[PDB]
Design a binder for this molecule. Structure first.
Ligand SMILES: CCN1c2cc([N+](=O)[O-])ccc2N(C)C(=O)c2cccnc21
Lengths: 406, 519
């Protein structure tokens, strides 16, 4: 085992467990009993005060369940480990995700650190204490795991790596991102070979489950959503106001935007539906403004030293808008997600977004979710299927910012 | 200390060391009393005579009371001894259940040898020339931090085997009480009951015998429990003509306790009495409504009602009703109105709202608690139509989901009293609001109110505009604030203003509200 310690002075987490559904509970039971059998984890006593939450999520295209531990807090108190994310990956044609988490089950965990991996299986209506264990092996989801296993991992990958270096292989937590430019067919092929190379070179010491319906992400086609202005035929007082509003807002970002002319068109106390004729003057001001928005504001760069943020907005109808920036008004990306029910949608989007963040910057963002905590807490596990968990917060967006997107 | 129980290793909070607190000498009456007890204990192995090589010591006095407070301050935190308490409706029916008080409770479990030295205490010797006797616990000392949790722990492992040998049987450990029920012909039960005692006894654990045990029903944690039915421990509503703020709060408190089983309790009126009160001992005369309410509650409470238990076979059904503004009630049964539980919800989440928003929130709470009790979500029966729900749905910028649910035509039906035009109304006057308004048809009114917030002024303006306009009206504003509120479409609010406004809105045929940046 490799000695690992929490960041100086910090103590282990003592997070509370969220109630679960009998069904989900039973899953973890089966799972853990097995893991115990195989010495991966072992029941712990009361001399252990720590606890991380645990969940059961489903493996899509699988009959089996998956355990997901919320090591988020732990990872934050886990000393850093004093491969740089590949700029190439984002650029590739197609990327597929593999769940190489089980590979971790091999490496032993510094005994002195195990106690902190304490997690519990709740009991319905608190009618029984509740099963408590801690890890003995590297746990999936723990920051340390990929690091420690990095070693064996670079090795086991060396061959295939240089064998056909046309493919980019990136690991993030329990995820392995494989990027190529191959033809969709050749891709899925060389993809299956890696799976095998992996099994056939036992890190599983089962072939690597795909993530995301096995489906592939095409980062190549990830385009940013430019702001847009209505292309009205005839402009009513109302339309114009709504136009000026939006513009004013966007002016914050793009300083060259001007509304002086459009604002004139709105002299006095006219009636909302009264149709106003665009004047040559204003006509060329809109046009300009319109041209300015055609692209993302210049000068927005990613600073690895700052947190990545992501807010999502509901546009109703099953459509969603979202943005990723590290500084207000200075987005690094923006997109949308379309259709089920709200939550399902949201979780899908979050994961989708995270997955990109990872692919682009090899880091998870901090989402701002437009929903009520209790609701999220209740259903997210029902559709969640990634192996990581982003950091989130809950907000009540102003129906103004929504009106300025899509 | 000979025992079959594996000990839980204990350690003191980091850096900290054992307690070295002085012993306050005792009279010779006290000294003897201790010695006698301490010796019995030595005989039983619970403690052991140690040498003056142990630099530690906790105070003791006179029965024996060892104060471990300090040690407790120096002992590591253990895992939360039993988090939440199980609710009666989450249980399964039992042909019979027996309760066992756990004797020798803590005084029957081995203590991490490595940690015993810290439990060291000394009984002074009568003669002053001579030194005193130094002992140390060998078991879970009564009153010590670990004791509970550790015992709890141990207990379950002891139970562990037996449990498997008797899957049929069911045991619940709760403090120094052990609850066990089955659906075994009576005697078979009592029999198993005996096996149990013996099995425990097989690890030094003693327990009360059949004639000494308490018998159903069982009053625990405030309820009354029978093997097949449950309820709230009886509530007696005092009778008097002088209620004190204090009296009131208690009653209201008690009243709530009921609500979980007794449907229809109402506290609105009593609660109201507490307004502006100045002392717990201030006497508030009951209002006419209060009397009425109390009386009514008197009647409900008069007849004993009882909750049923959980049958994992059948489904869970939850029914909701609005029993007043921002006030809802519900009930969970599996078998038609054969309630497992009932309850209310008065949670006003946010300064403004609407039944749709609330009813939705109600559902959530229910959902949350169901999971917490029966590990599943109940199908819902709601007084709202899908169409109504969905409408609000799409509109709302916030996400939300309501599990499977069916419409119930049990008035009052939740609906939306109004809805802003998505497009500005043609031929309707257009008011521009900023403290007054100016419309496209030349009209205006500028009022200056005394004592008002900037945010509140905004709303008032709008208000004015609503008042003075016809059935259809366009309204332009620069208050994102006021806009968000209204756009949300509240049907109830803490502020009267909003309510007045709401009143106006509901009346209008059509209303278009718009925003425009100010200045
Ligand atoms: C069989 C156990 N038992 C019961 C269980 C319980 N728990 O799980 O937290 C708490 C109390 C309790 N008691 C006291 C009972 O009398 C009871 C009644 C009916 C069924 N199970 C009952």
């Amino acid at each position: 085992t490799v000695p690992v310690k929490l960041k100086p002075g910090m103590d282990g987490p003592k997070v509370k467990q969220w109630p679960l559904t009998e069904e989900k509970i039973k899953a973890l039971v089966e799972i853990c009993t097995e893991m115990e059998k195989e010495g991966k984890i072992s029941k712990i006593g009361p001399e252990n005060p720590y606890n991380t939450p645990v969940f059961a999520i489903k493996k899509k295209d699988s009959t089996k369940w998956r355990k997901l531990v919320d090591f988020r807090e732990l990872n934050k108190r886990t000393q850093d480990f004093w491969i740089p994310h590949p700029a190439g990956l984002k650029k590739k044609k197609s990327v597929t995700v593999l769940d190489v988490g089980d590979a971790y089950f091999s490496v032993p965990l510094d005994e002195d650190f195990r106690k902190y991996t304490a997690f519990t299986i709740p009991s319905i209506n608190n009618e029984t204490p509740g099963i408590r264990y801690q890890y003995n092996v590297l746990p999936q989801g723990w920051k340390g795991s990929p690091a420690i296993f990095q070693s064996s991992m670079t090795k086991i990958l060396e061959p295939f790596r240089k064998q056909n270096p046309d493919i980019v292989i990136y690991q993030y937590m329990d995820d392995l991102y494989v990027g190529s430019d191959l033809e969709i067919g050749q891709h899925r092929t060389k993809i299956e070979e890696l799976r095998q190379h992996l099994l056939r070179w036992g890190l599983y010491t089962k072939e690597p489950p795909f993530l995301w319906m096995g489906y592939e992400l095409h980062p190549d086609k990830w385009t940013v959503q430019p702001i847009v202005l209505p292309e009205k035929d005839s402009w009513t007082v109302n339309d114009i106001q709504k136009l000026v509003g939006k513009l004013n807002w966007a002016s914050q970002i793009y300083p060259g935007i001007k509304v002086r002319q459009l604002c004139k068109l709105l002299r006095g106390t006219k009636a909302l539906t009264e149709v106003i004729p665009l004047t040559e003057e204003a006509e060329l001001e809109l046009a300009e403004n319109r041209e300015i928005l055609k692209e993302p504001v210049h000068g927005v760069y990613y600073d690895p030293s700052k947190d990545l943020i992501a807010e999502i907005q509901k546009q109703g109808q099953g459509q969603w808008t979202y943005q990723i920036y590290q500084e207000p008004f200075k987005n690094l990306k923006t997109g949308k997600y379309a259709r089920t029910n709200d939550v399902k949608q949201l979780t899908e989007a979050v994961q989708k977004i995270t997955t990109e963040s990872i692919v682009i910057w090899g880091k998870t963002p901090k989402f701002k979710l437009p929903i009520q905590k209790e609701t999220w807490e209740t259903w997210w596990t029902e559709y969640w299927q990634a192996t990581w968990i982003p950091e989130w917060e809950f907000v009540n967006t102003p129906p103004l910012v929504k009106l300025w997107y899509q | 200390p000979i025992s079959p129980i594996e000990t839980v290793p204990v350690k003191l909070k980091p850096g900290m060391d054992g307690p070295k607190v002085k012993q306050w000498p005792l009279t010779e009456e006290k000294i003897k009393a201790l010695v006698e007890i301490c010796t019995e204990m030595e005989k039983e192995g619970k403690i052991s005579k140690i040498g003056p090589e142990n630099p530690y010591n906790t105070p003791v006095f006179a029965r024996k009371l060892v104060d471990f407070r300090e040690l407790n301050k120096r002992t590591q935190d253990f895992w939360e001894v039993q988090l939440g308490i199980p609710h009666p409706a989450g249980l399964k029916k039992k042909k019979s259940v027996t309760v066992l008080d756990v004797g020798d409770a803590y005084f029957s479990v081995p203590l991490d040898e490595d940690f015993r030295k810290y439990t060291a205490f000394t009984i002074p010797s009568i003669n002053n020339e001579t030194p005193g006797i130094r002992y140390q616990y060998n078991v879970l000392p009564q009153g010590w931090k670990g004791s509970p949790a550790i015992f709890q722990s141990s207990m379950t492992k002891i139970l562990e085997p037996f449990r498997k040998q008797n899957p049929d049987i069911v045991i619940y450990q709760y403090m120094d009480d052990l609850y066990v029920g089955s659906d075994l012909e009576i005697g078979q039960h009592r029999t198993k009951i005996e096996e149990l005692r013996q099995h425990l006894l097989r690890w030094g654990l003693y327990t009360p015998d059949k004639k000494h045990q308490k018998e159903p029903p069982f009053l625990w944690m405030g309820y009354e429990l029978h093997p097949d039915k449950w309820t709230v421990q009886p509530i007696v509503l005092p009778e008097k003509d002088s209620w004190t703020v204090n009296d009131i709060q208690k009653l209201v408190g008690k009243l709530n306790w009921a609500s979980q089983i007794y449907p229809g309790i109402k506290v609105r009126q009593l609660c109201k009495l507490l307004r502006g009160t100045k002392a717990l001992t201030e006497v508030i005369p009951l209002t006419e409504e209060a009397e009425l309410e109390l009386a009514e509650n008197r009647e409900i409470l008069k007849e004993p009602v009882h909750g049923v238990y959980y049958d994992p076979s059948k489904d869970l059904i939850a029914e909701i009703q609005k029993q007043g503004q921002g006030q809802w009630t519900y009930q969970i049964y599996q078998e038609p109105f054969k309630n497992l539980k009932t309850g209310k919800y008065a949670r006003m989440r946010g300064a403004h709202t609407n039944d749709v928003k609330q009813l939705t929130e109600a559902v959530q709470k229910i959902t949350t608690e169901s999971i917490v009790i029966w590990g599943k979500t109940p199908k819902f029966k709601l007084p709202i139509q899908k169409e109504t729900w969905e409408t609000w749905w799409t509109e709302y910028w916030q996400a939300t989901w309501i599990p499977e649910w069916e419409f119930v035509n049990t008035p009052p039906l939740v609906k939306l009293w109004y809805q802003l035009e998505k497009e500005p109304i043609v031929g309707a006057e257009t008011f521009y609001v900023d403290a007054g308004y100016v419309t496209n048809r030349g009209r205006q009114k500028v009022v200056t109110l005394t004592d008002t917030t900037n945010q509140k002024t905004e709303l008032q303006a709008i208000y004015l505009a609503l008042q003075d306009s016809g059935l259809e009206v366009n309204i332009v504003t620069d208050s994102q604030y006021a806009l968000g509120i209204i756009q949300a479409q509240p049907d109830q609010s803490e502020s009267e203003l909003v309510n007045q406004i709401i009143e106006q809105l509901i009346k209008k045929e059509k209303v278009y509200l718009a925003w425009v940046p100010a200045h």
